[PDB]
């Protein structure tokens, strides 16, 4: 967390490992499945039951991944979505993931996004959003999605970002319920 | 870097977060926050800055500015930096955890939806704004789809909202960034 010449949030070995080991997950469920492997790695690593990762929309090349590091990280903005997006733009040398020349980018996340991440996804340059758990599922193990605009789906769809949900919802709920059990 | 989320801080901003400072009046706080806007514009950042202060002493805790382009991080808004460096200095994700004083977030402009959310989770009890949502939209920058009545939305969470403070100077710092935003060299910039 704390430094001075920088805002710095360190990552546990699995996340570091996920962001630096090559991986091509073509099918949507292959991406989501790997994202769920990370959620579980995260709990084991003292973090919230959320993970996400930016892949290139068509190939399924993993660019970056992120998990909740809010508590261990002392940073309320360290939602899975934020780190996965920001680490993706680091790796690609741009703040906009849809700058000319770059292959289309997808953020595959374990749960639907909270208001904050909802904004993050918009500015990010990402061209699609694939979720696992619904917002009900999320705000039924204690996590708050916050006041999003009515029709946040349409809001994202209305700027070149296509939304999908429920994908491997059940397996993601298994994961949610286990955390909430403990 | 791919080993940590790392947004680097320009020397002036390291200084801001280095040097102690107590600004009691709201105008005193917003004034410092707008020093940092023009300072940022001169360090390749966007026309936005923010600071976390102790609401009831005016002790500067931490400061932030748009480091989007130079940091290549669409998430690196002033608010996010200000709030995060405040959380890191104070050793907690929750700026309102027991033991810590009430925190205030002083921003040079009304927050976009992302930072609107950031505010809700930050821990801050109060957000003081300079430039109105309209002012920021006028020169291009997008606020994004904030929920209808986000202001009351925040106030309902015990987070107090104040906007338009030093709006004038805020507006002036916004236009001079615009007037020096193009690519053709204007030596006056
Ligand atoms: N409140 C909340 N919601 C989600 N989807 N993810 C996190 O990390 N927090
Ligand atoms: Zn979030
Ligand atoms: Zn913002």
Short mmCIF file of C-alpha atoms and ligand atoms in Angstrom, two decimals:
data_model
loop_
_atom_site.label_atom_id
_atom_site.label_comp_id
_atom_site.label_asym_id
_atom_site.label_seq_id
_atom_site.Cartn_x
_atom_site.Cartn_y
_atom_site.Cartn_z
CA UNK A 1 0.00 0.00 0.00
CA UNK A 2 1.97 2.96 1.42
CA UNK A 3 4.88 4.68 -0.41
CA UNK A 4 5.44 8.28 -1.63
CA UNK A 5 6.69 8.58 -5.23
CA UNK A 6 3.75 6.31 -6.16
CA UNK A 7 0.32 4.86 -5.49
CA UNK A 8 1.21 1.17 -5.31
CA UNK A 9 -0.87 -1.90 -4.77
CA UNK A 10 1.15 -5.14 -4.63
CA UNK A 11 -0.35 -8.37 -5.79
CA UNK A 12 -0.20 -11.85 -4.27
CA UNK A 13 1.90 -14.50 -6.14
CA UNK A 14 -1.09 -16.04 -8.00
CA UNK A 15 -2.21 -12.67 -9.46
CA UNK A 16 1.36 -11.76 -10.41
CA UNK A 17 1.58 -15.24 -11.89
CA UNK A 18 -1.72 -14.80 -13.77
CA UNK A 19 -0.56 -11.45 -15.29
CA UNK A 20 2.78 -12.90 -16.52
CA UNK A 21 2.07 -16.39 -17.63
CA UNK A 22 0.81 -16.80 -21.24
CA UNK A 23 -2.79 -17.99 -21.68
CA UNK A 24 -5.27 -18.33 -24.59
CA UNK A 25 -8.85 -19.06 -23.51
CA UNK A 26 -10.94 -18.98 -26.68
CA UNK A 27 -14.40 -20.02 -25.40
CA UNK A 28 -16.33 -17.58 -23.11
CA UNK A 29 -16.70 -20.26 -20.44
CA UNK A 30 -12.96 -20.99 -20.61
CA UNK A 31 -12.34 -17.33 -19.72
CA UNK A 32 -14.95 -17.27 -17.00
CA UNK A 33 -13.68 -20.59 -15.59
CA UNK A 34 -10.19 -19.26 -15.27
CA UNK A 35 -11.56 -16.09 -13.65
CA UNK A 36 -13.25 -18.30 -11.06
CA UNK A 37 -9.99 -20.16 -10.38
CA UNK A 38 -8.67 -16.69 -9.48
CA UNK A 39 -11.62 -15.77 -7.21
CA UNK A 40 -10.75 -18.87 -5.14
CA UNK A 41 -7.05 -18.10 -5.15
CA UNK A 42 -8.11 -14.67 -3.83
CA UNK A 43 -10.02 -15.96 -0.79
CA UNK A 44 -7.08 -18.17 0.05
CA UNK A 45 -5.05 -14.93 -0.18
CA UNK A 46 -7.20 -12.86 2.23
CA UNK A 47 -9.26 -11.08 -0.44
CA UNK A 48 -12.92 -10.64 -1.37
CA UNK A 49 -14.81 -13.20 -3.56
CA UNK A 50 -14.27 -11.25 -6.78
CA UNK A 51 -11.93 -11.51 -9.71
CA UNK A 52 -11.82 -10.28 -13.31
CA UNK A 53 -9.59 -10.28 -16.34
CA UNK A 54 -9.20 -8.48 -19.62
CA UNK A 55 -8.82 -10.77 -22.65
CA UNK A 56 -8.61 -9.82 -26.32
CA UNK A 57 -12.22 -10.26 -27.45
CA UNK A 58 -11.65 -12.70 -30.34
CA UNK A 59 -8.46 -14.75 -29.64
CA UNK A 60 -8.95 -15.12 -25.87
CA UNK A 61 -5.43 -14.03 -25.03
CA UNK A 62 -5.25 -13.05 -21.33
CA UNK A 63 -3.85 -9.52 -21.03
CA UNK A 64 -4.36 -8.79 -17.41
CA UNK A 65 -6.25 -10.07 -14.39
CA UNK A 66 -7.25 -8.62 -11.01
CA UNK A 67 -8.93 -9.59 -7.77
CA UNK A 68 -10.34 -7.69 -4.85
CA UNK A 69 -7.43 -6.49 -2.72
CA UNK A 70 -9.48 -3.93 -0.86
CA UNK A 71 -8.77 -5.12 2.67
CA UNK A 72 -5.19 -6.59 2.49
CA UNK A 73 -4.41 -3.70 0.11
CA UNK A 74 -5.79 -0.76 2.23
CA UNK A 75 -7.57 0.58 -0.88
CA UNK A 76 -11.34 0.84 -1.32
CA UNK A 77 -10.89 1.25 -5.05
CA UNK A 78 -9.10 -2.08 -5.46
CA UNK A 79 -12.06 -3.93 -6.92
CA UNK A 80 -11.21 -6.74 -9.31
CA UNK A 81 -12.43 -4.63 -12.28
CA UNK A 82 -10.12 -1.66 -11.54
CA UNK A 83 -6.92 -3.63 -11.31
CA UNK A 84 -7.66 -5.89 -14.23
CA UNK A 85 -8.42 -2.87 -16.41
CA UNK A 86 -5.54 -0.70 -15.17
CA UNK A 87 -3.01 -3.53 -15.41
CA UNK A 88 -4.25 -4.25 -18.97
CA UNK A 89 -3.64 -0.62 -20.07
CA UNK A 90 -0.16 -0.74 -18.41
CA UNK A 91 0.78 -3.83 -20.36
CA UNK A 92 -0.53 -2.36 -23.66
CA UNK A 93 1.14 1.06 -23.08
CA UNK A 94 -2.13 3.04 -23.28
CA UNK A 95 -4.97 4.31 -21.04
CA UNK A 96 -7.43 3.50 -23.78
CA UNK A 97 -7.92 -0.12 -24.69
CA UNK A 98 -9.67 0.84 -27.91
CA UNK A 99 -7.01 3.16 -29.37
CA UNK A 100 -6.42 2.60 -33.12
CA UNK A 101 -4.39 -0.57 -33.81
CA UNK A 102 -5.30 -2.43 -30.62
CA UNK A 103 -7.35 -5.61 -30.88
CA UNK A 104 -10.80 -5.33 -29.27
CA UNK A 105 -10.74 -5.91 -25.49
CA UNK A 106 -13.09 -7.77 -23.19
CA UNK A 107 -13.43 -7.67 -19.42
CA UNK A 108 -14.60 -10.96 -18.08
CA UNK A 109 -15.69 -10.53 -14.48
CA UNK A 110 -16.99 -12.94 -11.79
CA UNK A 111 -19.88 -10.68 -10.70
CA UNK A 112 -21.79 -7.69 -12.18
CA UNK A 113 -20.11 -4.38 -11.46
CA UNK A 114 -20.75 -1.82 -8.70
CA UNK A 115 -21.33 1.82 -9.59
CA UNK A 116 -17.59 2.63 -9.32
CA UNK A 117 -16.45 -0.17 -11.54
CA UNK A 118 -19.41 0.62 -13.79
CA UNK A 119 -17.74 3.95 -14.55
CA UNK A 120 -14.33 2.28 -14.76
CA UNK A 121 -15.52 -0.03 -17.49
CA UNK A 122 -16.80 2.88 -19.51
CA UNK A 123 -13.57 5.00 -19.54
CA UNK A 124 -11.45 1.87 -19.98
CA UNK A 125 -11.65 1.28 -23.76
CA UNK A 126 -12.99 -2.25 -23.20
CA UNK A 127 -15.54 -3.41 -25.84
CA UNK A 128 -17.42 -6.07 -23.90
CA UNK A 129 -18.43 -7.20 -20.46
CA UNK A 130 -19.13 -10.80 -19.53
CA UNK A 131 -20.40 -11.41 -16.02
CA UNK A 132 -21.01 -14.55 -13.94
CA UNK A 133 -23.06 -13.67 -10.83
CA UNK A 134 -25.99 -11.25 -10.99
CA UNK A 135 -26.33 -8.17 -8.78
CA UNK A 136 -28.86 -10.02 -6.55
CA UNK A 137 -26.27 -12.70 -5.94
CA UNK A 138 -23.78 -10.03 -4.97
CA UNK A 139 -26.02 -8.07 -2.65
CA UNK A 140 -27.08 -11.31 -0.98
CA UNK A 141 -23.71 -12.22 0.49
CA UNK A 142 -23.32 -8.70 1.88
CA UNK A 143 -21.58 -6.66 -0.84
CA UNK A 144 -23.17 -3.34 -1.95
CA UNK A 145 -23.42 -2.53 -5.71
CA UNK A 146 -24.20 1.07 -4.89
CA UNK A 147 -26.53 3.50 -6.70
CA UNK A 148 -26.02 2.78 -10.40
CA UNK A 149 -28.12 4.59 -13.04
CA UNK A 150 -31.37 2.79 -13.86
CA UNK A 151 -30.46 0.57 -16.83
CA UNK A 152 -26.70 0.40 -16.42
CA UNK A 153 -26.74 -2.42 -18.95
CA UNK A 154 -28.23 -0.18 -21.67
CA UNK A 155 -25.85 2.53 -20.48
CA UNK A 156 -22.83 0.37 -21.31
CA UNK A 157 -24.40 -1.11 -24.42
CA UNK A 158 -25.00 2.49 -25.60
CA UNK A 159 -21.21 3.15 -25.98
CA UNK A 160 -19.84 0.18 -27.87
CA UNK A 161 -19.60 -2.18 -24.89
CA UNK A 162 -21.80 -5.29 -25.10
CA UNK A 163 -23.06 -6.85 -21.83
CA UNK A 164 -23.57 -10.57 -21.13
CA UNK A 165 -24.52 -12.15 -17.80
CA UNK A 166 -25.30 -15.41 -15.99
CA UNK A 167 -22.39 -17.06 -17.69
CA UNK A 168 -21.28 -19.83 -15.32
CA UNK A 169 -23.44 -18.04 -12.74
CA UNK A 170 -23.98 -21.25 -10.73
CA UNK A 171 -20.30 -22.10 -10.28
CA UNK A 172 -19.65 -18.48 -9.33
CA UNK A 173 -22.45 -18.70 -6.72
CA UNK A 174 -20.95 -21.83 -5.33
CA UNK A 175 -17.87 -19.74 -4.81
CA UNK A 176 -19.85 -16.82 -3.28
CA UNK A 177 -21.77 -19.10 -0.93
CA UNK A 178 -18.55 -20.78 0.34
CA UNK A 179 -17.02 -17.43 1.22
CA UNK A 180 -20.26 -16.26 2.85
CA UNK A 181 -20.31 -19.56 4.77
CA UNK A 182 -16.87 -18.57 6.16
CA UNK B 1 4.83 -2.83 -14.74
CA UNK B 2 3.03 -6.16 -14.33
CA UNK B 3 3.84 -7.04 -10.76
CA UNK B 4 1.69 -4.42 -9.00
CA UNK B 5 -0.86 -1.64 -9.68
CA UNK B 6 1.55 1.27 -9.77
CA UNK B 7 0.71 4.82 -10.73
CA UNK B 8 3.72 7.12 -10.46
CA UNK B 9 3.49 10.56 -8.84
CA UNK B 10 5.09 13.70 -10.42
CA UNK B 11 7.56 15.47 -8.07
CA UNK B 12 5.07 18.30 -7.37
CA UNK B 13 2.47 15.79 -6.29
CA UNK B 14 4.99 13.89 -4.11
CA UNK B 15 5.63 17.25 -2.48
CA UNK B 16 1.95 17.87 -2.00
CA UNK B 17 1.65 14.54 -0.26
CA UNK B 18 4.96 15.20 1.56
CA UNK B 19 4.69 18.63 3.10
CA UNK B 20 2.36 19.15 6.09
CA UNK B 21 -0.32 21.84 5.73
CA UNK B 22 -3.40 23.01 7.66
CA UNK B 23 -6.06 24.94 5.75
CA UNK B 24 -9.10 25.64 7.86
CA UNK B 25 -11.50 27.61 5.63
CA UNK B 26 -13.17 25.87 2.64
CA UNK B 27 -11.76 28.55 0.37
CA UNK B 28 -8.32 27.84 1.84
CA UNK B 29 -8.67 24.13 0.98
CA UNK B 30 -10.19 24.67 -2.49
CA UNK B 31 -7.42 27.18 -3.18
CA UNK B 32 -4.72 24.59 -2.59
CA UNK B 33 -6.63 22.07 -4.66
CA UNK B 34 -6.65 24.50 -7.62
CA UNK B 35 -2.88 25.23 -7.26
CA UNK B 36 -2.52 21.58 -8.07
CA UNK B 37 -4.76 21.74 -11.14
CA UNK B 38 -2.51 24.29 -12.87
CA UNK B 39 0.52 22.44 -11.51
CA UNK B 40 -0.91 19.24 -13.07
CA UNK B 41 -1.65 20.86 -16.45
CA UNK B 42 2.09 21.75 -16.45
CA UNK B 43 3.00 18.16 -15.62
CA UNK B 44 1.08 16.73 -18.63
CA UNK B 45 -1.95 15.73 -16.62
CA UNK B 46 -5.56 16.80 -17.07
CA UNK B 47 -7.21 19.88 -15.51
CA UNK B 48 -8.36 18.08 -12.30
CA UNK B 49 -7.07 17.75 -8.75
CA UNK B 50 -8.46 16.70 -5.35
CA UNK B 51 -7.33 16.44 -1.78
CA UNK B 52 -8.29 14.47 1.33
CA UNK B 53 -8.43 16.68 4.41
CA UNK B 54 -9.51 16.15 8.02
CA UNK B 55 -12.91 17.84 7.85
CA UNK B 56 -12.55 19.34 11.35
CA UNK B 57 -8.97 20.58 11.52
CA UNK B 58 -8.07 21.04 7.85
CA UNK B 59 -5.02 18.79 8.08
CA UNK B 60 -4.06 17.79 4.55
CA UNK B 61 -3.92 14.00 4.52
CA UNK B 62 -3.26 13.33 0.82
CA UNK B 63 -3.62 14.83 -2.67
CA UNK B 64 -4.41 13.56 -6.19
CA UNK B 65 -4.57 14.80 -9.78
CA UNK B 66 -5.53 13.33 -13.19
CA UNK B 67 -2.66 11.05 -14.14
CA UNK B 68 -4.68 9.28 -16.85
CA UNK B 69 -2.58 9.93 -20.00
CA UNK B 70 0.84 10.11 -18.46
CA UNK B 71 0.07 7.09 -16.21
CA UNK B 72 -1.88 5.22 -18.94
CA UNK B 73 -4.64 4.38 -16.51
CA UNK B 74 -8.18 5.46 -17.32
CA UNK B 75 -8.84 4.90 -13.64
CA UNK B 76 -6.27 7.41 -12.45
CA UNK B 77 -8.63 10.33 -11.76
CA UNK B 78 -7.67 12.88 -9.12
CA UNK B 79 -10.37 11.64 -6.80
CA UNK B 80 -9.16 8.03 -7.00
CA UNK B 81 -5.58 9.06 -6.31
CA UNK B 82 -6.47 11.51 -3.53
CA UNK B 83 -8.69 8.93 -1.89
CA UNK B 84 -6.27 6.04 -2.34
CA UNK B 85 -3.15 7.87 -1.14
CA UNK B 86 -5.22 8.94 1.86
CA UNK B 87 -6.16 5.36 2.54
CA UNK B 88 -2.53 4.26 2.17
CA UNK B 89 -1.12 6.99 4.42
CA UNK B 90 -3.72 6.27 7.06
CA UNK B 91 -3.23 2.46 6.75
CA UNK B 92 -6.86 1.49 5.97
CA UNK B 93 -9.47 0.89 3.23
CA UNK B 94 -11.97 2.71 5.36
CA UNK B 95 -11.47 6.41 5.83
CA UNK B 96 -14.22 6.30 8.53
CA UNK B 97 -13.05 3.21 10.50
CA UNK B 98 -13.10 3.84 14.30
CA UNK B 99 -10.07 5.83 15.47
CA UNK B 100 -9.77 7.95 12.34
CA UNK B 101 -11.24 11.51 12.17
CA UNK B 102 -13.96 12.41 9.68
CA UNK B 103 -12.45 12.93 6.25
CA UNK B 104 -13.42 15.45 3.54
CA UNK B 105 -12.67 15.21 -0.20
CA UNK B 106 -11.98 18.58 -1.82
CA UNK B 107 -12.35 18.38 -5.67
CA UNK B 108 -11.77 20.92 -8.43
CA UNK B 109 -14.84 19.51 -10.23
CA UNK B 110 -17.96 17.48 -9.70
CA UNK B 111 -17.00 13.74 -9.76
CA UNK B 112 -17.72 11.39 -12.68
CA UNK B 113 -19.69 8.19 -12.00
CA UNK B 114 -16.60 6.09 -11.29
CA UNK B 115 -15.37 8.57 -8.64
CA UNK B 116 -18.94 9.01 -7.51
CA UNK B 117 -18.81 5.32 -6.49
CA UNK B 118 -15.23 5.77 -5.18
CA UNK B 119 -16.63 8.44 -2.87
CA UNK B 120 -19.35 6.12 -1.52
CA UNK B 121 -16.73 3.48 -0.54
CA UNK B 122 -13.87 5.81 0.36
CA UNK B 123 -15.01 6.40 3.95
CA UNK B 124 -15.14 10.23 3.48
CA UNK B 125 -18.04 12.08 5.19
CA UNK B 126 -18.00 15.11 2.94
CA UNK B 127 -17.23 16.11 -0.63
CA UNK B 128 -16.61 19.73 -1.56
CA UNK B 129 -16.74 20.52 -5.31
CA UNK B 130 -15.50 23.48 -7.41
CA UNK B 131 -16.52 23.27 -11.07
CA UNK B 132 -20.04 22.13 -11.90
CA UNK B 133 -20.84 19.08 -13.97
CA UNK B 134 -21.80 21.43 -16.81
CA UNK B 135 -18.53 23.29 -16.77
CA UNK B 136 -16.62 20.02 -17.27
CA UNK B 137 -18.99 18.77 -20.05
CA UNK B 138 -18.62 22.14 -21.88
CA UNK B 139 -14.90 21.66 -22.54
CA UNK B 140 -15.37 18.01 -23.57
CA UNK B 141 -14.65 15.69 -20.64
CA UNK B 142 -17.51 13.35 -19.92
CA UNK B 143 -19.15 12.91 -16.49
CA UNK B 144 -20.74 9.61 -17.52
CA UNK B 145 -24.17 8.25 -16.54
CA UNK B 146 -24.50 9.19 -12.89
CA UNK B 147 -27.68 7.85 -11.32
CA UNK B 148 -30.48 10.45 -11.46
CA UNK B 149 -30.07 12.60 -8.32
CA UNK B 150 -26.58 11.30 -7.38
CA UNK B 151 -26.26 14.35 -5.13
CA UNK B 152 -29.17 13.25 -2.95
CA UNK B 153 -27.92 9.71 -3.40
CA UNK B 154 -24.68 10.73 -1.63
CA UNK B 155 -26.47 12.81 0.99
CA UNK B 156 -28.63 9.86 1.87
CA UNK B 157 -25.38 7.98 2.73
CA UNK B 158 -24.35 10.61 5.29
CA UNK B 159 -21.89 12.08 2.77
CA UNK B 160 -22.47 15.84 2.55
CA UNK B 161 -22.25 17.63 -0.81
CA UNK B 162 -21.13 21.17 -1.54
CA UNK B 163 -20.50 22.41 -5.09
CA UNK B 164 -19.48 25.57 -6.97
CA UNK B 165 -16.90 26.69 -4.40
CA UNK B 166 -14.31 28.85 -6.21
CA UNK B 167 -16.24 27.86 -9.37
CA UNK B 168 -14.99 30.98 -11.11
CA UNK B 169 -11.26 30.16 -10.82
CA UNK B 170 -12.10 26.51 -11.43
CA UNK B 171 -13.78 27.62 -14.72
CA UNK B 172 -10.82 29.77 -15.67
CA UNK B 173 -8.32 26.93 -15.12
CA UNK B 174 -10.57 24.73 -17.31
CA UNK B 175 -10.70 27.04 -20.30
CA UNK B 176 -6.91 27.75 -20.35
CA UNK B 177 -6.29 23.99 -20.52
CA UNK B 178 -8.76 23.90 -23.46
CA UNK B 179 -7.09 26.87 -25.17
CA UNK B 180 -3.78 24.97 -24.85
CA UNK B 181 -5.03 21.48 -25.76
CA UNK B 182 -4.53 21.30 -29.53
CA UNK B 183 -1.44 19.98 -31.28
CA UNK B 184 -0.18 23.08 -33.14
CA UNK B 185 2.42 24.86 -31.00
CA UNK B 186 1.20 27.99 -29.24
CA UNK B 187 4.31 29.44 -27.58
CA UNK B 188 2.15 31.20 -24.97
CA UNK B 189 1.42 27.79 -23.35
N1 LIG C 1 -19.44 -4.02 -3.63
C1 LIG C 1 -18.70 -4.78 -4.59
N2 LIG C 1 -19.29 -5.31 -5.71
C2 LIG C 1 -18.60 -6.03 -6.62
N3 LIG C 1 -19.22 -6.60 -7.78
N4 LIG C 1 -17.28 -6.21 -6.40
C3 LIG C 1 -16.67 -5.68 -5.29
O1 LIG C 1 -15.33 -5.85 -5.09
N5 LIG C 1 -17.37 -4.97 -4.38
ZN1 LIG C 2 -16.49 -2.29 -7.98
ZN1 LIG C 3 -13.65 10.62 -12.07
#
